[PDB]
Amino acid sequence: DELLKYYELHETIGTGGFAKVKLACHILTGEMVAIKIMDKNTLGSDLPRIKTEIEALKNLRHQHICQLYHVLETANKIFMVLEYCPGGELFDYIISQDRLSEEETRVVFRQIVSAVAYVHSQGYAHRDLKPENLLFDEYHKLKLIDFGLCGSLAYAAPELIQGKSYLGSEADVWSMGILLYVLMCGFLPFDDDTAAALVAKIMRGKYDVPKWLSPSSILLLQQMLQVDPKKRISMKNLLNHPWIMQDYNYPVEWQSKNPFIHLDDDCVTELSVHHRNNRQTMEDLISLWQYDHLTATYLLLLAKKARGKPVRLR
Numbered sequence: 001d002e003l004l005k006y007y008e009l010h011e012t013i014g015t016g017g018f019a020k021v022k023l024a025c026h027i028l029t030g031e032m033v034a035i036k037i038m039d040k041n042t043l044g045s046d047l048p049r050i051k052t053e054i055e056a057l058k059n060l061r062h063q064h065i066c067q068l069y070h071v072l073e074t075a076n077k078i079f080m081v082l083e084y085c086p087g088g089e090l091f092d093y094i095i096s097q098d099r100l101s102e103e104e105t106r107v108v109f110r111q112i113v114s115a116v117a118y119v120h121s122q123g124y125a126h127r128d129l130k131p132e133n134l135l136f137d138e139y140h141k142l143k144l145i146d147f148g149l150c151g152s153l154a155y156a157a158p159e160l161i162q163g164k165s166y167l168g169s170e171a172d173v174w175s176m177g178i179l180l181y182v183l184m185c186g187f188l189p190f191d192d193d194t195a196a197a198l199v200a201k202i203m204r205g206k207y208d209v210p211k212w213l214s215p216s217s218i219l220l221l222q223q224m225l226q227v228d229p230k231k232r233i234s235m236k237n238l239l240n241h242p243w244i245m246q247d248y249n250y251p252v253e254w255q256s257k258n259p260f261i262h263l264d265d266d267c268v269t270e271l272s273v274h275h276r277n278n279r280q281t282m283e284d285l286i287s288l289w290q291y292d293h294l295t296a297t298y299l300l301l302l303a304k305k306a307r308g309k310p311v312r313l314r
């Protein structure tokens, strides 16, 4: 925890057997941040599992995907600096409310669908969608985290389950079906004690359908949760499914609303005075997009400027 002369570490909020997250604060900007701290000695040959995550995240920029700011590799630690999401967890939200109204699940699902549709357009699949992977920011907007791709068999598609060849996207829509189910009901559509009776239930593909589910809800579950992946609903069709649009009558807007197009002059200007060098060379240096400290500093001034705060380093 040494090269971090960029951040003032605060408290722990995430504890895993693979990794542990700490709240931190970006010295130069003032901006708050979350730092996933790994042990390479725990990973062993799960470096692949994380390095393919990082290159994945380097290629993503969406309003509903947790932003990656910075990577730092020391002798035996990997540090990911990530978008601060102080709204809380999707999962814990669900259990705190027992289950969300149909109209609240819809508002949220549309966010999930937005994230995932964008993921697919960029050439990836999440392949592990679940409540534990969705965070809320302070405006209660969802941030998809934790790319990575043990046992979320509960959320795994049947053809994934059984070593069959598969499309990631068709896999993901399955998992979105399960998620939807648990937003509206508060428990998993397929469940048992051991793993074997769980897998058996998935392969049969039929589930209890609580009294409170609406005709439209019951419909969309069926189209998402098809065993035969030929018969599952495409993303294409999800984006503007009548249930999806039942309350806000517009298709899901999946395209990145914050795209990276040009460099932002102000940020480039502050970064230029601070690093006592000229505009061209500061653009050249940022354009290298190394996700080093300068890339963090840039992304965070950009976020500072969106809050309408002055665009300044300390």
Ligand SMILES: COc1cc(O)cc(Nc2ccc(C(=O)Nc3ccccc3)c(OCCC[NH3+])c2)c1
Pocket: 013, 014, 015, 021, 023, 033, 034, 036, 057, 066, 067, 068, 082, 083, 084, 085, 086, 087, 088, 135, 144, 145, 146, 147
């Ligand atoms: C792509 O985004 C990723 C990848 C990944 O491997 C892990 C995470 N995990 C995160 C990221 C941020 C937070 C966070 O900002 N949490 C927070 C902030 C303020 C107050 C309370 C919590 C995070 O939170 C911990 C939840 C899961 N243990 C996890 C993102």
